[PDB]
C-alpha cells in the first residue's frame, strides 16, 4: 500500500560542465 | 598576604565609591497603584524600585515583546530593604502581590545600554581570571 | 576536520508510538590519523534525540 | 520543560474504530441478501505521549544548590583614570 | 474546554509616574 | 498550596465516549439497511 | 473468534524506520574531547 | 621548556595580529528587529553578530536553500561577551529568542571563500601532528 | 490529523541594513 520514499532525484536539465578552470592539482 | 588585603580593601573602596553614573527616571505606571513603588528608576545597570516602610515587598517581572513575563533575578537593597534592584534594564515590568498587578513602563528606554567590560557592577573593579589553569 | 568518518551503532527497534531511534555514535577518525572515542548520542539537525 | 503535545489518537484508537466499522458493514452486507475491537484496543490502548518543544524558546535553570566561584575569580581595582 | 486562568492583567488607563519626588539615593 | 485543579476530563473519557458513539452510531447506519 | 484469535496473535508488530542516506544529522558531544596529545601550534614565521 | 614558553608566546602573538583580513558588511534583516544585532559581518571564515548591552543574546541557526534551520556552533567573543562568533559563512541566518524569530541575509556571499590550509582560525599559526605513531 | 507546529517565520517584508554603523572590531 506504502511504500518508502525514495530520495530526491536530480532533474537531468541544467547538464553543464563542472570545470570551469582546470584544477591547479592537474599541476596546470 | 599584603597585597591580597590591600587589594581588597581597595575593591570595598571602589565598589562604596560609585561615581559617574547616569540615572534615567522617566518611568510611568497604571494598574493596582496600592502595590505602587514611591520611586523607581534605573543606572543604566540594574533598575531600582523604591517601596515605603508599610508596603509589603511584592513580586517583579519580566515583560518581553508579546507581553509574555519570565522571572528576573533581584536583590534587595537599601538601608532598611525597601529597594529590589532587579538585574537587567527592560522597557516594561509587572509588578504582583497575590491578586493585584501593576505594570511599570520605561519611557526613556536605551536600547544600547553601557557594555560590562569588567564583570562586575562598578566600571572601578576588575574580575581577574585567578583558577589559571 | 571536515571528511572525518564518524562510526555508530542502533539496536533494539521502536515500540508503537515512537518515530524515532537511539544512534550511539562511537568513534570518528580525523584524515590525518588521529581517533577519538567520543560516544555521543545522535540527533536531528535541530538537535531532537534520536 | 513543556511544548506541544502529541497524544496519538489514531495510533491508540484507529484499530479498534476500523475494526467495529467494519464488523458492522460486513453485518449489513450479510443482512442485506434479502471481541476484536475490545482486543485491538487492550493493545494499543497504552501509547504514551510525546512532548514537542521548538527552539530558541527561553526556559530557565533554578538553581538547586550553591555555586562557589572562589577559586575561579578574583577582584581587582582599576586605578583611578 | 477548559484552560488555567491568567493571572490579572494592569488596566492600561491610570497611567502616572513613579517618581513624584526625586529618590535620595540618586543623591537629590 | 493550592490553586486551579485541572481534572483532565476529557482525556479521562473520550476514549469511552468516543468508542461508545461510534458503536451506536456503526449500529444505527447497520440497522439502516432495511 | 477467529478475527479476535488473528488480531491477538499479530497486532503487536513493532515499526520500522526508513531514514535515506544523505541526511543531515548531529552528533551532540556528551563528554569533554581532549585533543592535547596529538597536535601541537606554531607561528608560522613572517612573509 | 624554554622552547615551548617561546612557542606559546609566538602563537599567542600570531593569533592577536590579525593581520590581513577582508571584512564583509553586506548584511540585511527582515523579521523581529526587537532582537536585532547593531551590527553583523563576516571575516571570510566567522560571522559576527554584535549585540547591544541590554539585549538579551538569542539563539542563531543555520539556514540552507530549502529553508531548513541547523544548528552551528558558536563561540561568545568580545570584551563584554557582547559578539556572538558562528563559526561558518552562509547567505542566510535565522536568529530566534522565545518567540521572536528575525532573518538575517548575506548580501554578498562568496562561494569560494579562503582555504583553511593551517588547521587554525589564523593564516599564521599553523597546527601540526605532534603525537607522531 | 494534527502535527507539531513549527517556529514564528518571520515577516520579509521590513528589510534594511543590520550596520548602520562600522563596528569599532573591523577598526574602523
Known sequence: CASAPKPKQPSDFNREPVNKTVPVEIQR | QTREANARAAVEAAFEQRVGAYYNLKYMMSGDKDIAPVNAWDDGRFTYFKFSANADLPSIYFVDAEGNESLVPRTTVGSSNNI?????????????????????????????????????????????????? | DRGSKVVGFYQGGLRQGQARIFVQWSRIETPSGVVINLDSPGTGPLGEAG | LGGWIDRHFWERFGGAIMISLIGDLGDWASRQGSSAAAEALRNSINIPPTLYKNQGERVNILVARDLDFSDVYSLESIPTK
Chains 1, 5, 9 share one sequence.
Open chain 2, 84 to 133: 529590589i534592584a532587579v538585574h537587567k534594564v527592560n522597557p516594561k515590568w509587572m509588578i504582583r502581590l497575590g491578586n493585584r498587578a501593576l505594570a511599570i513602563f520605561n519611557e526613556a528606554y536605551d536600547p544600547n545600554g553601557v557594555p560590562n567590560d569588567t564583570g562586575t557592577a562598578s566600571p572601578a573593579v576588575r574580575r581577574v581570571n585567578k583558577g589559571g589553569n
